[PDB]
Amino acid sequence: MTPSLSAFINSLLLGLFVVVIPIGAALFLVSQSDRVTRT
Amino acid sequence: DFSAAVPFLKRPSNLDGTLAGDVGFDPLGFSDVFDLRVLREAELKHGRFAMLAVLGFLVQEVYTFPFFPKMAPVDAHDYFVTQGGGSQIIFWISFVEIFGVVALFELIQGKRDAGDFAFDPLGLGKDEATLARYKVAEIKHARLAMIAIGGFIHQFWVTKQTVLEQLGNFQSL
Amino acid sequence: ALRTRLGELLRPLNSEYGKVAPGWGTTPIMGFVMLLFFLFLLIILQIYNSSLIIENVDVDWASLG
Amino acid sequence: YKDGIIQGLGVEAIPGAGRPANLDGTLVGDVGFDPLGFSNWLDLRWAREAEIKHGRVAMLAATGMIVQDAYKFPGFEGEFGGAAMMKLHNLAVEQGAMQQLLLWLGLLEIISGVPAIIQTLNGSERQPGDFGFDPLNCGANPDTLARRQLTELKNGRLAMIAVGGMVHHYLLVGRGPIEFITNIPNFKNPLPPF
Amino acid sequence: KPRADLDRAMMDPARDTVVSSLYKSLGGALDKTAVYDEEDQLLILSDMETFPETELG
Amino acid sequence: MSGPNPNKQPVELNRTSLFWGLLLIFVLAVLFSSYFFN
Amino acid sequence: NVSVAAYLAVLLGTFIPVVFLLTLYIQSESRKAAET
Amino acid sequence: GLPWYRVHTVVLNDPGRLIAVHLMHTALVAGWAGSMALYELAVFDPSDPVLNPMWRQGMFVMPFMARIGVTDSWGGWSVTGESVANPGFWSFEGVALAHIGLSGLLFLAAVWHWVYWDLELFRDPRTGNPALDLPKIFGIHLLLSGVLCFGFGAFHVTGAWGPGIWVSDAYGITGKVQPVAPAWGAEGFNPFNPSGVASHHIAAGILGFLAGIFHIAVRPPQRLYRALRMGNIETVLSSSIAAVFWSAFITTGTMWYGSATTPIELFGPTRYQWDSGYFQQEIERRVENSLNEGLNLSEAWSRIPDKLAFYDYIGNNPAKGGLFRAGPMNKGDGIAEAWLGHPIFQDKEGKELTVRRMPAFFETFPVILVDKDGIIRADIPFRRAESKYSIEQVGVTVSFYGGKLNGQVFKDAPTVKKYARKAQLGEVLEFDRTTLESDGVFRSSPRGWYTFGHANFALLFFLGHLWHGSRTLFRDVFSGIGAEVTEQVEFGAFQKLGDRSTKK
Numbered sequence A: 001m002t003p004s005l006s007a008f009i010n011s012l013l014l015g016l017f018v019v020v021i022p023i024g025a026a027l028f029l030v031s032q033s034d035r036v037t038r039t
Numbered sequence B: 001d002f003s004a005a006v007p008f009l010k011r012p013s014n015l016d017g018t019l020a021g022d023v024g025f026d027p028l029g030f031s032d033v034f035d036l037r038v039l040r041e042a043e044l045k046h047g048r049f050a051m052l053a054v055l056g057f058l059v060q061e062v063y064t065f066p067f068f069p070k071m072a073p074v075d076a077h078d079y080f081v082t083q084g085g086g087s088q089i090i091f092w093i094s095f096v097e098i099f100g101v102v103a104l105f106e107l108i109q110g111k112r113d114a115g116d117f118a119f120d121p122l123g124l125g126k127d128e129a130t131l132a133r134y135k136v137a138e139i140k141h142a143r144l145a146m147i148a149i150g151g152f153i154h155q156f157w158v159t160k161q162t163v164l165e166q167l168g169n170f171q172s173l
Numbered sequence C: 001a002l003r004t005r006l007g008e009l010l011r012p013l014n015s016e017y018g019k020v021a022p023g024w025g026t027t028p029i030m031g032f033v034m035l036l037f038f039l040f041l042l043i044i045l046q047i048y049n050s051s052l053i054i055e056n057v058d059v060d061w062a063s064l065g
Numbered sequence D: 001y002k003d004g005i006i007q008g009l010g011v012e013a014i015p016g017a018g019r020p021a022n023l024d025g026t027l028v029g030d031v032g033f034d035p036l037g038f039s040n041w042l043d044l045r046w047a048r049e050a051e052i053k054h055g056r057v058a059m060l061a062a063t064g065m066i067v068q069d070a071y072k073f074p075g076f077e078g079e080f081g082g083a084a085m086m087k088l089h090n091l092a093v094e095q096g097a098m099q100q101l102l103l104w105l106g107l108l109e110i111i112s113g114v115p116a117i118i119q120t121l122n123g124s125e126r127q128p129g130d131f132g133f134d135p136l137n138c139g140a141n142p143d144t145l146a147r148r149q150l151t152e153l154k155n156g157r158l159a160m161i162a163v164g165g166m167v168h169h170y171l172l173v174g175r176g177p178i179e180f181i182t183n184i185p186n187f188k189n190p191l192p193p194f
Numbered sequence E: 001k002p003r004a005d006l007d008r009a010m011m012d013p014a015r016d017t018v019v020s021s022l023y024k025s026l027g028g029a030l031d032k033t034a035v036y037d038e039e040d041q042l043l044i045l046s047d048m049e050t051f052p053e054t055e056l057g
Numbered sequence F: 001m002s003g004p005n006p007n008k009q010p011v012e013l014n015r016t017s018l019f020w021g022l023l024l025i026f027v028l029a030v031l032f033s034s035y036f037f038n
Numbered sequence G: 001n002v003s004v005a006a007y008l009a010v011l012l013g014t015f016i017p018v019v020f021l022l023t024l025y026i027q028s029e030s031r032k033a034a035e036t
Numbered sequence H: 001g002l003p004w005y006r007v008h009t010v011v012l013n014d015p016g017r018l019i020a021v022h023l024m025h026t027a028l029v030a031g032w033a034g035s036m037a038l039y040e041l042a043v044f045d046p047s048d049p050v051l052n053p054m055w056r057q058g059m060f061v062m063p064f065m066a067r068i069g070v071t072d073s074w075g076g077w078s079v080t081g082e083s084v085a086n087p088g089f090w091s092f093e094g095v096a097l098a099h100i101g102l103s104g105l106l107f108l109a110a111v112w113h114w115v116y117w118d119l120e121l122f123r124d125p126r127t128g129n130p131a132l133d134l135p136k137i138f139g140i141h142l143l144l145s146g147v148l149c150f151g152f153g154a155f156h157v158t159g160a161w162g163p164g165i166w167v168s169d170a171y172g173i174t175g176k177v178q179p180v181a182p183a184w185g186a187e188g189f190n191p192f193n194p195s196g197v198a199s200h201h202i203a204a205g206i207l208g209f210l211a212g213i214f215h216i217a218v219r220p221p222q223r224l225y226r227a228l229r230m231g232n233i234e235t236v237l238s239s240s241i242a243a244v245f246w247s248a249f250i251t252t253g254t255m256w257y258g259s260a261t262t263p264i265e266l267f268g269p270t271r272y273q274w275d276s277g278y279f280q281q282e283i284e285r286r287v288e289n290s291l292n293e294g295l296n297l298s299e300a301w302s303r304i305p306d307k308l309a310f311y312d313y314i315g316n317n318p319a320k321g322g323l324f325r326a327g328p329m330n331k332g333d334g335i336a337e338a339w340l341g342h343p344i345f346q347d348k349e350g351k352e353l354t355v356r357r358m359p360a361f362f363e364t365f366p367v368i369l370v371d372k373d374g375i376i377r378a379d380i381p382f383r384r385a386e387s388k389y390s391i392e393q394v395g396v397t398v399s400f401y402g403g404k405l406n407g408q409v410f411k412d413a414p415t416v417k418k419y420a421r422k423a424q425l426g427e428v429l430e431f432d433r434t435t436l437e438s439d440g441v442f443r444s445s446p447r448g449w450y451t452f453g454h455a456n457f458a459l460l461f462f463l464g465h466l467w468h469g470s471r472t473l474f475r476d477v478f479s480g481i482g483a484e485v486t487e488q489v490e491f492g493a494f495q496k497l498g499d500r501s502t503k504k
């Protein structure tokens, strides 16, 4: 485990939990909340 | 209906319990996808190979033929790679299992029981109760020897000594 | 349409045009495999870029010896 | 005991607030305490199984913290020395104890929990945290069984918090649990090698 | 080869395992795929409209 | 069978396209002749 | 001085696409003429 | 009628003639390979592999033949410089003739498939229209490609049944085709480790075989079938073009930056070996090691091979050529005859001076001589300027160690200026100019030409991929839009854009 490899794994984790999880979670919440009336 | 062996897991839908040794143990569920007859064929053949291998390890450690050189069983494998006896052994195994392929095809077609080559030359099992008891004993011994042969090989790999030799002086490391 | 021996041999291999799996099928596991492939490409790109230094992996002409 | 005053609809933590809709006071240890809305997007079977597993693992971990600092098996204290806590892990990895433990526990988890996870998430009768492991027929009475369930859950929470506390205690001072509680002042600390 | 007479209608999901669920996820027991797309997917639209001619024009 | 292929289509090129193509090819030759020669 | 075999490049690259365009135009014009 | 740019769309719904035109294209490509190999064999000079290798002569497909085993010729020579008494069939000529014969056979097959287009295999049993089950065809082709990749990496590269691939040392002195054992660790992802080729091909062949089994077995989801338009073959064209220009970018990068798959004895050195002073550092290290053994400068510099000194030269840099400076590298600075040796420049006081090397950016660079500290002690004026540090004033003398001029000391100003101009370019060499009438402007290696062609091809195929993805996803509005668009384009008419059921 080199420092560069540890930094790469930490970058993957930070990218997930900072960009992908929050954006996807907010998208899911607002899509479930603000729906479209298809009547 | 939960499994008899595993109380927290459901019994697999393909393991009704008619087969020998069918206690319901299948956590990963290979019987849910692949054919149970082919799996029992593979299990029985693995076990028979392993039982013969365990008996061979014991005998080879206790007695080697005088026209063969004296050595451990595991490193004899390369000696018979070079000499040609192992090629003969796998040649005859391949010759038997060429017809084994046909037997497996008949097993797929459902005209043969799993692991049933009808090989009873001495007539030991003819009564149905004794036949079922022998099936259970055979599968239990097959599983035990499948574990035991890997145990022997890995113990020789880590300790550089054979089975009864290690039981002689139990060196721990 | 003329019928040939090779055509009749290969006919079952081209006989299911338009046959689909209903619903989403295997899309989630496909996305999982695509994610793994993306991670693998990222790893090898950063190795070739020397942004990811691994033990015993010297990205250099001198590693040929 | 499952009474309605220690768990359920009656007692309600952070009073003056509303209970979550999914947290309907049916599971064990429901005191109405779910801030941050974790019970809305997460399956309660998965969360309950995770809580039970973490609690049991932390119980074993904390008992190891207490016992290793007091008594050591013959043979390990010569190979490892006076190491414990965060030093026993790195020496045991190179020794062979940690790799064997990882392999055996991972094999046990693979052949026990994963199919249990799948079945209890797909709708089997197996409750989360239930492996049916009842030797000596302990807790055969249902009221006693509920008492044991609630006690196990609360002691698992306590064990998780205590394990975190002891880990941080060694990460700061550099002493084991009983050594940390008998050496209360923060001075004269040794080296805490991670 | 996976067994015949396998479908996700008789197989109880409560009895699922690692291999069975991995088989379901990899498109196994797909005997419900008798449906076809029934869309041309090469049909270029040809519904041209004729504009009416005005007096100016 | 060997006969009328239903996918046979005629090919057109009006005079405007012919003149555009001639202009394009001749201008490209004018541009790249100096570089091919040297 | 000026490299040889570039005359071949310039002249063939000028002629061949011009040939292609002229053939296309004449073919199209004759098809139109026989359409009448 | 069809426009000139749509003439090939007649085989879009004709599978037999699609196969016919693919066969014709394959025959053309194979014939180009054969004819190019024959021409390169006609213009190749195998006499001196050290100072006139294949990349100095503009050989393009010869490096790719020599990369994975084909190194001998029916003429009795090898590209490694050795003599082969029994060449065997798979020489360069054998490969070229095999490609010509393959081109002819594929041409005949294309003729047959163009004439016999209405095969019953190409018609859907359910509908009767000519159709291709593209997902299962992809499964079959992926399985075939996995088998081919696994076989190549398991028998050809490893030498189990095959020649192996070209493996050289770190500095391109002793390179040959060797069997290559695969490396299954993280070192297989070292791009300069040739074991990665074998391990990659074995693992990727296994994975492709499994994926082909999966794609034959399992039908696509309806959502992916409708979304990607899997009933249309233009989505296959679009995704194939995308993958192809992805691969072209990958090969462009591995050619320009160098890897184990682009050795310097076949494609020439890279520009970053000149930028970093790679061969210069190696030569200095060897000379220092020889000086530490008690040798003098002449014996230390005479031990340097001519190949290693030839690599340390800016005329072999692929980043020194020109776009329209066509021809081989020998058409530029000339055909290399001999290494003249390492020049060491000394002033009237005996202090050593090094001519600053020309960077790859500069068409022209001023000739300046620095000392060991980095201070300009001598130089050459621009063309006719009044000078302060000129060669005539400082009295610079040059002494050569090693090479053809070993031991000679030149003290006259014109010769010292000439050799300083030559030392600006790196190692001083002797070039032959009357054989090809070399003009004297540097030209690029096959590495640089490959990089240029494939970078431009990848960039253009990006545009092609965009065009075909657009024509796939917008097939219904190919000839224009209808009157059903006017209601959708009203702002706020529908809640969801383009959905008629979400009307407010």
Ligand SMILES: CC1=C(C#C/C(C)=C/C=C/C(C)=C/C=C/C=C(C)/C=C/C=C(C)/C=C/C2=C(C)CCCC2(C)C)C(C)(C)C[C@H](O)C1
Pocket (backbone or CB within 6 Å): B074, B077, B078, B146, B147, B149, B150, B151, B153, D111
């Ligand atoms: C490669 C090679 C060779 C070789 C070789 C060979 C033949 C190597 C063979 C290796 C083998 C067979 C290893 C088997 C291991 C079995 C294990 C670990 C089973 C564990 C079962 C457990 C833990 C059960 C657990 C349990 C379960 C699940 C159910 C009940 C509960 C519990 C009991 C706990 C040679 C010798 C020919 C030489 C050649 O030159 C090189």
Ligand SMILES: CC1=C(C#C/C(C)=C/C=C/C(C)=C/C=C/C=C(C)/C=C/C=C(C)/C=C/C2=C(C)CCCC2(C)C)C(C)(C)C[C@H](O)C1
Pocket (backbone or CB within 6 Å): D085, D086, D089, D090, D160, D161, D163, D164, D165, D167, D194
């Ligand atoms: C990394 C590493 C290693 C390691 C390691 C290890 C052992 C890492 C273990 C880390 C652990 C177990 C951390 C746990 C922390 C628990 C906390 C903070 C609990 C907080 C509870 C709170 C705040 C409660 C709040 C509350 C709530 C919710 C509301 C009510 C009020 C209240 C109850 C207060 C090794 C051993 C491999 C060595 C390696 O060389 C380095």
Ligand SMILES: CC1=CCCC(C)(C)[C@H]1/C=C/C(C)=C/C=C/C(C)=C/C=C/C=C(C)/C=C/C=C(C)/C=C/C1=C(C)CCCC1(C)C
Pocket (backbone or CB within 6 Å): H027, H028, H029, H031, H032, H033, H035, H100, H101, H102, H103, H104, H105, H107, H108
């Ligand atoms: C100038 C130019 C334009 C822009 C791009 C770029 C700059 C790269 C450059 C590239 C131009 C291109 C695409 C050139 C293409 C060259 C090609 C395709 C050359 C291929 C020629 C094919 C040849 C001889 C085939 C010979 C085969 C023969 C006899 C077969 C004969 C036989 C047959 C027919 C039946 C069986 C028996 C036998 C003897 C085998």
